[PDB]
Amino acid sequence: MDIDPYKEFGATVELLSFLPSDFFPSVRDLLDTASALYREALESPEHCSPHHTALRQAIVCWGELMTLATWVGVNLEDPASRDLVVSYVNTNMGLKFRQLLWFHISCLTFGRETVIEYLVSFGVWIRTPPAYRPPNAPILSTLPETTVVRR
Amino acid sequence: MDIDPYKEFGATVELLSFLPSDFFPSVRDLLDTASALYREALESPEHCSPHHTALRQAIVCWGELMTLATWVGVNLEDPASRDLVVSYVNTNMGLKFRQLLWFHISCLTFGRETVIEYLVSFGVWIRTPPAYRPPNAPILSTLPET
Amino acid sequence: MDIDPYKEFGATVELLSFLPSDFFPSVRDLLDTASALYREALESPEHCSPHHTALRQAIVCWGELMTLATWVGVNLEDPASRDLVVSYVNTNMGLKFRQLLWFHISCLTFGRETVIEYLVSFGVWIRTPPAYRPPNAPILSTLPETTVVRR
Amino acid sequence: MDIDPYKEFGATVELLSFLPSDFFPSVRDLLDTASALYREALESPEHCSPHHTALRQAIVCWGELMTLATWVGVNLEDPASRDLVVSYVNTNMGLKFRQLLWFHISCLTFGRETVIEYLVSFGVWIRTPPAYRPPNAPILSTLPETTVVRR
Amino acid sequence: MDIDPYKEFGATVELLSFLPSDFFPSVRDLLDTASALYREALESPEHCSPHHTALRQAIVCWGELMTLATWVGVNLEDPASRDLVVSYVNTNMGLKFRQLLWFHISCLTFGRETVIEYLVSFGVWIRTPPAYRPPNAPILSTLPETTVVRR
Amino acid sequence: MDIDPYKEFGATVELLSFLPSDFFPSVRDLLDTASALYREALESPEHCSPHHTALRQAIVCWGELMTLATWVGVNLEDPASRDLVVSYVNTNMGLKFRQLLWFHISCLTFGRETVIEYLVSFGVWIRTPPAYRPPNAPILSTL
Secondary structure, eight states, X not given: OOOOTTXXXXXXXXXXXXXXXXXXXOHHHHHHHXXXXXXHHHSSSSOOOHHXXXXXXXXXXXHHHHHXXXXXXXXXXXXXXXXXXXXXXXXXXXXXXXXHHHHHHHHHHTOHHHHHHHHHHHHHHHHSOGXXXXXXXOOOOSSOSSOOOOO | OOOOSSGGGTOOHHHHSSSOGGGSOOHHHHHHHHHHHSXXXXXXXXXXXXXXXXXXXXXXXXXXXXXXXXXXXXXXXXXXXXXXXXXXXXXXXXXXXXXXXXXXXXXXXXXXXXXXHHHHHHHHHTTSOGGGSOSSOOOBOOOOOO | OOOOTTTTTTOOTTGGGSSOGGGSOOHHHHHHHHHHHSHHHHSSSSOOOHHHHHHHHHHXXXXXXXXXXXXXXXXXXXXXXXXXXXXXXXXXHHHHHHHHHHHHHHHHHTOHHHHHHHHHHHXXXXXXXXXXXXXXXXXXXXXXSEEEOOO | OOOOTTTTTTOOTTTSSSSOGGGSOOHHHHHHHHHHHSHHHHSSSSOOOHHHHHHHHHHHHHHHHHHHXXXXXXXXXXXXXXXXXXXXXXXXXXXHHHHHHHHHHHHHHHOHHXXXXXXXXXXHHHHSXXXXXXXXXXXXXXXXXXXXXXX | OOOOTTTTTTOOTTTSSSSOGGGSOOHHHHHHHHHHHSHHXXXXXXXXXXXXXXXXXXXXXXXXXXXXXXXXXXXXXXXXXHHHHHHHIIIIIHHHHHHXXXXXXXXXXXXXXXXXXXXXXXXXXXXXXXTSSOSSOOOOOSSOTTOXXXX | OOOOTTTTTTOOTTTTTXXXXXXXXXXXXXXXXXXXXXXXXXXXXXXXXHHHXXXXXXXHHHHHHHHHHHHHHHHOOOHHHHHHHHHHIIIIIHHHHHHHHHHHHHHHHHOHHHHXXXXXXXXXXXXXXXXXXXXXXXXXXXX
């Protein structure tokens, strides 16, 4: 079909194509952020929000893909094809999962309006040619880059 | 007829020449930004804005220019002239379209007054000597302060 | 994308396919009608109407295409390919511009309802086989074909 | 100085450029019509209307042009060049004066709005290919379509 | 006659004498800034403000100076003396016109009080020895110190 | 740009083309008139009038030209080139500067409408053929 898992939330696959391919953190770092900020709500028995539902589903499917990787590394004798499949699962399927994770963790941490405005502004930034581009790329944050809160 | 594509919007061809010619993103990146942000409005059977009207027209005209370039590639046998024509369509007309798409997408995203003050300020900045101007190049951003 | 520059106004590319390919006036005649009826409004600094916006954009792009034609006629040494490109720009791209011009000038002069009704009626006329087709094709006009207004 | 003699009245040299060369009566017939419809007003010491002012001026410059033609015919001994200049004066300048006289006589007879809509509709008719238009040009006249003066 | 072109506006040739020679954009950049910020007001038939009057006059005298430079380059056969005069016109008189254009464009952009306090503070900064002053000259700009145009 | 320095003051360059090139007094005479009539107001720190602003600007741009001329006469060793360029500075730019000074001093002294009617009347006088042209050329005066 044509689900396009972001258009339900307000972004699209092409709106997230503003961000380059290597912009997204690693799958380990994104799973660490998830378990560090929303573990007790991702394990609760209630529909907390659509982001929580989609994030639970994403994590279960990555778990199914990591079980696949373990199984193939255990069961395939041909090492060339074995490492081929494992590297494919880890990188080429991993990129789609990291784009999915980044989006959900960031839209939970900062908000839909903030994440969409950040996507637009980072599109502007990465579009602007290098010679006329400021060094301060836009970034998501809840505090100013320097925070003078003495006590 | 001596028509400005920007005079009704409050800009001018010389006001968009006030920025470096290589400041504007590629036509590919700008068409991607348009289809990523306002596709459902650039395909609806409503006007919704002079910017949507002008942006629909601009994209149709670029599609016609790209069909021209494909036709040239297929139907010109002389490679020198063929690649000269294609390079012209991609660089001169491509620069004019990138200046046009940038203006309309940026206006729709940020605001007419915001984009005009940005044009003026970035033009003044790129001309101020380096030691007496803020060090970071100006940029447009929807992300507020925290 | 799928802009279809008429569906914003109420027609479509297929509704304007009722009219044959050679029905549309020349680009020179349509630019003359434009500069004879709406020049002071096409050069004004205000959004007069969506037809005016689209017509300004169309005229600027035809100007860009005529600058292309001048450039190629000046810069291409190979005469065969030069005249090939110039004839292409003038006829095959010209037809699309004349369909665009005719539509906008007529919808400004006569009105959207009148232009759409004319498209439907000319579809009926040009569809009817020649033997059962009246000689009076439908035409757009603000006066009767004969106008007895003595003084 | 690039002056349009109709722009003052609402027409345009590009709006009257559609009426074919054979559309206008001869200079003699248009002068007879002027002197038989508005002689007592084109010979009065009163500012009657802009059409009267322009008609007076046009007739004076045609008188000067006819004096020119007579002088050429009398004083150019070369018959070839003499007939060349006479033909030029009687056809090119003659057509311009026929277009100018027709416009003013017809404005005075019918009305500004009437003659302008007539020019518009005749442009629409003369731009259509001969195969898609009613075969009888639109007519501007004071007579009924039956041409029977009752009462 | 010992006229101060800024004393009328509140500055003084001795108040602008502190801004170094490298502080001002080139004549070309300052003319581009003028013609891109206030062209429709520097070309209007209206007395807009003393800054507009002085800007019009300054630009006319620079036009005369550029005509002089072109005439020198064309008509002085001696290359040494020709380049000598051209260098003089482009550097000395050029610096005076850069100082004059900067002052008027900056007044029109920012304000009399703002540009005067800026000149005062820049004088304080440029008079201090390099060892007792903050290393970054004071800046007059419309951009935020972050140079990110939001809203 | 097409700034046209007289447009704001109500004239145009083609209106001042009514007066010939050899009609305007020397720049010396015009500067003498200025320093005799409006020195205390051109040296004042006040926007007295747009004519005062334009006249201050013109006087400063002429002072810069004269400094250029002196600098050239001192520093250019080639006498031919030096005399050529100083003669250019004195005549070809002095012409436009005495046009500007004439316009502004005359407007200040007599009035905008008076100077404009003078320009129109001088157009009439210089267009009239010589056989029907009075020997008394038009002249500006408040007497």
